[PDB]
From a paper:
Chromatin-remodeling complexes (remodelers) are large, multisubunit complexes that regulate gene expression and genome maintenance. The HSA domain of Sth1, the catalytic subunit of the budding yeast SWI/SNF-family remodeler RSC (Remodeling the Structure of Chromatin), recruits Arp7 and Arp9. In turn, the Arp7/9 heterodimer forms a tight complex with another auxiliary subunit, Rtt102. Arp7/9 regulates the nucleosome sliding, ejection, and ATPase activities of RSC in an Rtt102-dependent manner.
Here, we pre-incubated Rtt102-Arp7/9 with ATP prior to crystallization, and obtained crystals using polyethylene glycol 3350 as the main precipitant. The crystals, which diffracted to a relatively low resolution (3.25 Å), contain two copies of the Rtt102-Arp7/9 ternary complex in the P1 unit cell (RMSD = 0.51 Å for 833 equivalent Cα atoms). The conformation of Rtt102 is also very similar to that observed in the complex of Rtt102-Arp7/9-HSA, and, although the current structure reveals 13 more amino acids for this subunit, a large portion of Rtt102 (90 amino acids out of 157) remains unresolved in the electron density map. More importantly, unlike in previous structures, composite omit maps of the current structure clearly showed the presence of ATP in the nucleotide-binding cleft of Arp7 but not Arp9 in both complexes of the unit cell. A nucleotide-bound structure of Rtt102-Arp7/9 reveals that ATP binds only to Arp7, helping stabilize a closed conformation of Arp7 that potentiates binding of Rtt102-Arp7/9 to the HSA domain. Not surprisingly, we found here that Arp7 lacks ATPase activity, both alone and within the ternary complex Rtt102-Arp7/9, whereas the quaternary complex Rtt102-Arp7/9-Sth1301–1097 displays strong DNA-dependent ATPase activity catalyzed by subunit Sth1. In particular, the all-important actin residue Lys-18, which anchors the nucleotide in place by interacting with both the α-phosphate and β-phosphate, becomes Val-18 in Arp7, which cannot support these interactions. In contrast, there is no cation associated with the nucleotide in the structure of Arp7. Indeed, Arp7 appears to lack a cation-binding site, as two of the residues that coordinate water molecules that hold the cation in place in actin, Asp-11 and Gln-137, have changed in Arp7 to His-11 and Glu-141, respectively. In summary, the biochemical and structural data presented here suggest that Rtt102 and ATP stabilize a conformation of Arp7/9 that potentiates binding to the HSA domain, which in turn releases intramolecular interactions between the pHSA domain and the P1 region of the ATPase domain.
Numbering used by the authors:
A (entry chain C): 1 to 35, 54 to 70, 76 to 90
B (entry chain B): 2 to 226, 274 to 378, 395 to 415, 421 to 444, 447 to 466
C (entry chain A): 0 to 38, 46 to 202, 214 to 275, 281 to 345, 379 to 462
Write the structure that this text describes.
Amino acid sequence: MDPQTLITKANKVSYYGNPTSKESWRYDWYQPSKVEKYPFRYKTWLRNQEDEESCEDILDLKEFDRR
Amino acid sequence: APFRQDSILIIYPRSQTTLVQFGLNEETFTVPELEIPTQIYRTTRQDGSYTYHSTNKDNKAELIKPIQNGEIIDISAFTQFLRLIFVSILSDRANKNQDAFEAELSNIPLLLITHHSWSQSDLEIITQYVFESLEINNLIQLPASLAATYSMISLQNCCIIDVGTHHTDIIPIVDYAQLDHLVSSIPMGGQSINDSLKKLLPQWDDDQIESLKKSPIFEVLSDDAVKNSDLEFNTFWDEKGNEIKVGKQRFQGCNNLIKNISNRVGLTLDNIDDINKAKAVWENIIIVGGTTSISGFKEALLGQLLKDHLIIEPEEEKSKREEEAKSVLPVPTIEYVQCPTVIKLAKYPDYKSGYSEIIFLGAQIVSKQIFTHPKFYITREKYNMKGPAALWDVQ
Amino acid sequence: MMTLNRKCVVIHNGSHRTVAGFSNVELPQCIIPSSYIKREFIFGTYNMIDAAAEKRNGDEVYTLVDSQGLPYNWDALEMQWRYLYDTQLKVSPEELPLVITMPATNGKPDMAILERYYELAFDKLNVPVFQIVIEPLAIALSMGKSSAFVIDIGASGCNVTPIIDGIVVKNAVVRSKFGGDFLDFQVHERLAPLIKQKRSTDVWYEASTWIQQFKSTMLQVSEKDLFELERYYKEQADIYAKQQEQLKQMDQQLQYTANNPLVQKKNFLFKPLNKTLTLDLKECYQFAEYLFKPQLISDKFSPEDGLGPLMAKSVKKAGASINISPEQVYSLLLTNVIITGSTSLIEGMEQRIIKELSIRFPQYKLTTFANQVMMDRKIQGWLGALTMANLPSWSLGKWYSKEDYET
Ligand SMILES: Nc1ncnc2c1ncn2[C@@H]1O[C@H](COP(=O)(O)OP(=O)(O)OP(=O)(O)O)[C@@H](O)[C@H]1O
């Protein structure tokens, strides 16, 4: 199959307590709220609230298996 | 939530080749099945974007070795390389078993053996990649040193000397914890022997020196030493098949390496703040690596450690005292306030001696430890809430 | 842990140790010397040691801070922070908040220093935001003590800062010049004969290797005044000598070749020459005694410059700077005592501190805390800064921003 096809089909399993939503993050600036806002921006991981590449060929395991 | 041990995936990226294993047998001790070179081919394009391939087919190609001296020089190539491996195991089982996605590939926890040099930034990215791009719901990022000591039962304090080809890592451990401020690395390794031998054997070929280094006649001998150590000249056969006659230089070349290691281990352990903790570390020394497999290497290094760093009464002073004691017809031992009193190698209880072996052994015990009572590793529940910042949850 | 969903870069520049790390880890990423080598720059211990052992000419070793605990070379300090960031921490300065420590003082160079840090932090390193923390206050607040008496002993000397209801008493801040650096001098000078106009690298190597081993192992602190202690044991020994002689007077006998703790010897191996060094316990007691009694070394120094009177001096002065009553300020300071710094790890230092402080204050009951984790005490300032970095809200400390820095 295709790598994404293998990735997408794999790791998908449903149990009790299993999260439906896959949250995605980004490393970017943030401006802290006042507890008006503080006058500085620092970098941290933020979660995309709205849910918004190079994919190569698979390998052969026996060539890289041991002897 | 549900897990079957055949699904667990362990990856141990190294500077040259990565060891991977999929599943644990539960019958016996786990051993790395697959050994893969650590590299990826990257064809740059006009877009300014990058494309990575398994093979270049002689095209723009190049080659990216994502790991240099154990560190990560290219994070992007490393993740794609990681992705390359993960996808590869998925297809192999997919082709072998039709229902695989519903059973063995249903949930695949990933256990990644990390390196002391990896930055927080790198680790955070790797976490993001595993959960987002690889769509894996469980991840374990385990330092190799802690993994290595995990195999050693009830080993609280120790110092791992890990000798690599181009570098050697010094990893002091105290209270089951890696002290990062004291971890160091020396640009010395197995290759330093080749560089050392090339000085003393200029007429030799770089191919012939390596062939000498791995030959059975190459060993490092103690001061105490038809047997090989006794005769001046001995011989070995090259990979070409040709005989090569070599003199005293077969016993040389490792001195420069062993001294620099010893010297570095000295300062490292001297900066351990609690002597009682420090004493324990000196009593447990772990010498591991490819180079260490050379005959007499572990003994030579250990000996060199005792030579310079051991605290004991100088034989010159002790001799005069025993001589002066008589002075009779027809001696108390000196006590020192410093560390160590004794230096010895880590005992392997209940065990085979390699680094790759013990780490994987440790990785297995950890899996038993984590999955039984999880409450280290990240779960999708945390990654959704905290994100790659979930990597750090402590205190 | 990540507070307010972020992490901070904690840095501490001391006279001796410079500690840098992240606020989430709880253990420092790196500990490097507060000195540096001028060739090019070499900032690592291991990096420095090699340059020293390399024995190059034109190599020099410079302190990064004045004895007052403040940085006196900013361009040099700039190269350190780049090394700390680029090498050990491996993160860009533009990304994260910066919590650094500056020592407590009676004066207000702080505005001069803050302006100096504004440049270093912002126009130079483009740091987004940063906080400054007062080290003794950091150490105190971290320990659960809102009010305390902090005795910090280190390379520069003894730094005694009284703290009441969460703020330092500026006037009562005192700084001795007797400490780890002074002790380094005496160990070298006294032992020179026994060993059998110097390269700075050579002086630094000796101080950082065999001398540091001497102080951490050989050195002890008397629980009492050494002369007073020595006279006690001598007379106690004289009685034992007279007691044993008298038993021979009764039944007679002749020469059977017939107990003083100060005469037991401590043996320190000197590896460079592979020769043993031996000193009686009294000679080990002597070095540390000079901190409490500096007049012994020279006569240039007064008894009051000693630690014992200084601690009392600070306590008295603490009362005068609030105007409950000054006499009662003693009750709050002596009840909460914090002994920190690496030089305070010398065996028996805690007792002598209590002893010297109890003498001048017999009426008040006291209790002293000294961190029993060896490593923590050395880096305690940085750990103090770490707790401040990890505070739940931004409102709990002063943060400085591009807003503060403007034309
Ligand atoms: N185990 C030990 N025992 C005794 N003394 C030590 C020990 N380790 C270090 N020292 C001494 O303590 C001093 C280091 O003090 P410290 O690390 O507290 O400095 P700092 O905190 O960077 O500077 P400051 O104390 O002025 O803020 C050095 O002079 C060193 O010789």
